[PDB]
Structures are given as C-alpha cells and as structure tokens.
From a paper:
The mutually antagonistic relationship of atypical protein kinase C (aPKC) and partitioning-defective protein 6 (Par6) with the substrate lethal giant larvae (Lgl) is essential for regulating polarity across many cell types. Although aPKC–Par6 phosphorylates Lgl at three serine sites to exclude it from the apical domain, aPKC–Par6 and Lgl paradoxically form a stable kinase–substrate complex, with conflicting roles proposed for Par6. Lgl has a double β-propeller structure and contains multiple phosphorylation sites for aPKC–Par6, with at least three serine phospho-acceptor sites (S655, S659 and S663 in human Llgl1, within a segment defined hereafter as the P-site) that map within a key membrane-binding loop13. The structure reveals the intricate interplay between aPKC–Par6 and its substrate Lgl, which, together with in vitro and in vivo data, supports a capture-and-release mechanism involving a stable phospho-intermediate.
A peptide spanning the Llgl1 P-site is able to bind the aPKCιKD with an apparent affinity (Kd) of 48 nM. We screened for crystals of the Llgl1 and Llgl2 P-site peptides and determined a medium-resolution structure for the Llgl2 P-site peptide spanning residues 634–662 bound to aPKCιKD in the absence of nucleotide. The Llgl2 P-site is identical to the Llgl1 sequence in this region but is ten residues shorter in numbering. The cocrystal structure of aPKCιKD–Llgl2P-site revealed ordered contacts between residues 650 and 656 of the Lgl P-site, including the C-terminal S653 (equivalent to Llgl1 S663). In this poise, Llgl2S653 is bound ready for phospho-transfer, with Llgl2F654 in the hydrophobic +1 pocket. The R655 side chain forms a hydrogen bond with the G398 carbonyl and a phosphate oxygen from phospho-T412, while the R651 side chain at the −2 position, relative to the phospho-acceptor, lies in a pocket formed between Y419 and E445 of aPKCι. Thus, we can predict the phosphorylation trajectory from snapshots of unphosphorylated peptide (X-ray structure) to a stalled initial site phosphorylation (cryo-EM structure), as well as the S655 and S659 phosphorylation binding poses, on the basis of related substrate peptide structures.
Numbering used by the authors:
A (entry chain A): 249 to 588
B (entry chain C): 647 to 656
Amino acid sequence: LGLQDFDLLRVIGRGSYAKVLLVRLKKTDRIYAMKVVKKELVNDDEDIDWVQTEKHVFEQASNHPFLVGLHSCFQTESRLFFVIEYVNGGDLMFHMQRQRKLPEEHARFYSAEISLALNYLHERGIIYRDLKLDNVLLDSEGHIKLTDYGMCKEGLRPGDTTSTFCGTPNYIAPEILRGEDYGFSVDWWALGVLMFEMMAGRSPFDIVGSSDNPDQNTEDYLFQVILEKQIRIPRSLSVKAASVLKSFLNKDPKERLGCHPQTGFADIQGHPFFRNVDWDMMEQKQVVPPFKPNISGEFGLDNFDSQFTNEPVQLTPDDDDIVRKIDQSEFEGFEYINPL
Amino acid sequence: KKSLRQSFRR
C-alpha cells in the first residue's frame, strides 16, 4: 500500500512531529485518519524509538474499544504514514475550552473509560506515559479513545520498572522528577491531574505562567511545585471527588491509588467516587455517554479547530537538498497492512 | 498554563 491508494480530503490536526489528514481509501470508500511524519524531524535515539514503539503498540494493543486501531503503514522517500481510525468528536482539551468545568458525573464517566484503557495497556505490559487532554479524543457517540502511543514503554515484565525522563511537564509524576525508576504508577498520577482539570477547570499547577518573575514561569519551577507544594482541592468538589484526586495525586507511588501491584485497578473500582459505575457495561460501551458531540456535513469536521481545517489539502513539495540527506536504512520494514 | 503541555523526551 502507498499514497496512490488514498484520496486526501482535509487537514484535521498537527502535532510536533506529525500533520494529520482525513483520507479515503480508493479501494473501499472507507475514510481514515492519516498521520504524516516527515523523516526530516526524526534524527536522534528519542525520535526513532517514538515511531517504532507507536507502530508496535498499534499492533500488539489497540484491539480495545477505547484505543485507536491502525489500518496500515507506508512511506515515501521523505515521510512516514500511519493510517488509523478517524475519530471525529474532538479532544478533551477542545471540549474543556468550550465548557470550562465539567460536572463530576461527566468526569466520572470519562475517567472510568480511560481507566479501562490504561488497565488494558498495563496488563499487556505497556506504560502510556503521555496521558493528557490533547491525547484523549471523543468519538462520534461520546466515548473516549487514547491516541498518541509514541511515548509508551513496552515489554515491561510484571514488577519491572524503567528509567526514561519523558512525558508532558504538567502531567509528569514525582517519581520521574525524583530520578527514581518507575512503573505503571506514573499513568495513575497523570489521570489524577487529568481528573483535576475536568472537575476544577484548570491544572493543579496553573500558577506556573502568571508570575511577575520570569524564572517562576519555567519547567524547573513547575517540577519544584509538583514535588514540594501541596495540591489544594476546590471547595465546590464533593468529598468523593476530593478523595480520589488526593488519592491519585499522592506524591508517594507506593501509597497512590491504582499502584498496589496486586490490587491496583480493583482499588480504583472500589473507590467511593466510582460507586455506581458498571465497569462491565462501561467496557462494552453500554453506558450512555453524558455528552453527544455534534457531527455535521459529509465528514463531521465540526470538532476540529478551524486553523487546521482551513489549511489547503496538499502534502508540501519536497526539497531534495533535505531529502537526499536522510538515512532510509533506519525505516526498512516500516510497511504494515492490518490482517483485516 | 504556559505550553508546558508540550510532549518531550530525554
């Protein structure tokens, strides 16, 4: 499979590495999302691993209903292409910007579905390591999907740990900042931060940005705040909310919710905050979502930010002075077609 | 916030 087999429809998204497009497979008239990564950008250890693991997790995982599946992979001389399922309900950042705070029942719904996705990855020996509002999409019906798997640790034996300093500063866990080896615990910390954002309407470390001192609007100042400052819960939120946020945002991973090596996920299910959640029905997509995203027109482009969708539908012409400098050897055996 | 919401790796 190649670029020939796809009718490019619209630009829908942009990461640091990637440009995202809506595409149609000419063979079947199914529409997919196409992540286009320029090889120009992938140069170090940290960059090749990002693509290789993203591919590996799409294969070995991603069968789950709250994870994005992969149609296929291919390359031109300049770019890597991932063809993945089109999910058209926006992301939780986009949704949070429209409705500044969420009700607790909405936050319960979204965090339950994430928890199942995380637990599924955890039991396949995978740490997500980049949970954030941007990486949690809503589908057309209003259920979540986790998307960006490039940061994942994999091949983790049960009770192993790893050492890499990665993630997103807002969501980074104290273990990582302390320089400790870490396991799945970092994912549960991130969920805590994520749940805080949904219920409170702002990050717990939101002061980092507003200060008169330039040196206190710094990644290093954020990391100091994550480690040493106490996270105050807003008075609005119930006793159950306050408990789960404080339990997930415990600075010690040993004593954090979700992180007992035996009973971790069970402890989450048994928390008063998730009293009335039917976890089997949740996982079978049988709990009616609290919000149905608006889908309009031929493709449902409503919930993608207009800056992306206005941009013209091309792939940028190549510059042969840059393309000739690329090591093609590093992307051999990239091609993949999903065994239908 | 500041765009300390950007991913990274080291």
